Scaffold this active site. Structure first.
Site, mmCIF file in Angstrom:
data_model
loop_
_atom_site.group_PDB
_atom_site.id
_atom_site.type_symbol
_atom_site.label_atom_id
_atom_site.label_comp_id
_atom_site.label_asym_id
_atom_site.label_seq_id
_atom_site.Cartn_x
_atom_site.Cartn_y
_atom_site.Cartn_z
ATOM 1 C CD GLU A 195 -2.999 -0.578 -0.170
ATOM 2 O OE1 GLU A 195 -2.956 0.528 -0.785
ATOM 3 O OE2 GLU A 195 -3.978 -1.322 -0.120
ATOM 4 C CB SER A 227 -11.811 9.376 -2.489
ATOM 5 O OG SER A 227 -11.099 8.541 -3.242
ATOM 6 C CG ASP A 274 -13.625 8.281 -5.508
ATOM 7 O OD1 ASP A 274 -12.566 8.595 -5.663
ATOM 8 O OD2 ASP A 274 -14.151 7.721 -4.740
ATOM 9 C CG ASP A 282 -6.470 5.766 -1.424
ATOM 10 O OD1 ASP A 282 -7.571 5.840 -1.191
ATOM 11 O OD2 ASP A 282 -6.052 5.563 -2.822
ATOM 12 C CG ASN A 339 -10.957 6.161 -0.373
ATOM 13 O OD1 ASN A 339 -12.225 6.593 -0.341
ATOM 14 N ND2 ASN A 339 -10.240 6.810 -1.246
ATOM 15 C CG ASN A 391 -8.168 7.429 -5.373
ATOM 16 O OD1 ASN A 391 -7.273 6.759 -5.860
ATOM 17 N ND2 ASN A 391 -8.528 7.647 -4.299
#
Length: 130
Positions: free
Chosen positions: A35, A51, A49, A53, A60, A46
């Site tokens: 990750e 959002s 959308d 992380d 998220n 991202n």
């Protein structure tokens, strides 16, 4: 902060991650490795959308933490996404536990399915005294 492998292994163990909801420490290590590369300051926006992380586990903003800029998002971990960017991973571990209490368990993270599920994850904790 970029953790070294065994350093993280014991840090996670002290935080109660070993076998949490049936998930081994090696699985958590494999998750953090793929990750963020063990980087607590890791972030990924991202554009699709809107959002983001956050942290060592790349949790998220749409559902887990609040950053104030993700449309229609919720805060299931009840944390400012900022808490997921600290060198101290206690809050991130508390949120990661929240994530896996849901139906999918460790499967919530697609990268875990892609690079940890049905893989030999033993190498992640070998020699760490855990």
């Amino acid at each position: 902060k970029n953790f070294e492998r065994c350093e993280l292994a014991r840090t996670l163990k002290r935080l109660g991650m070993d076998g949490y909801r049936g998930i081994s420490l090696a699985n958590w290590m494999c998750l953090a490795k793929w990750e963020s590369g063990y980087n607590t300051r890791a972030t990924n926006y991202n554009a699709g959308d809107r959002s983001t992380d956050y942290g060592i586990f790349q949790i998220n903003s749409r559902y887990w933490c609040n950053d104030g800029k993700t449309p229609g998002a919720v805060n299931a971990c009840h944390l400012s996404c900022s808490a997921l960017l600290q060198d101290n991973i206690a809050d991130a571990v508390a949120c990661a536990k929240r994530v896996v209490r849901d139906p999918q368990g460790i499967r919530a993270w697609v990268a875990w399915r892609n690079r940890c599920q049905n893989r030999d994850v033993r190498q992640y904790v070998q020699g760490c005294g855990v």
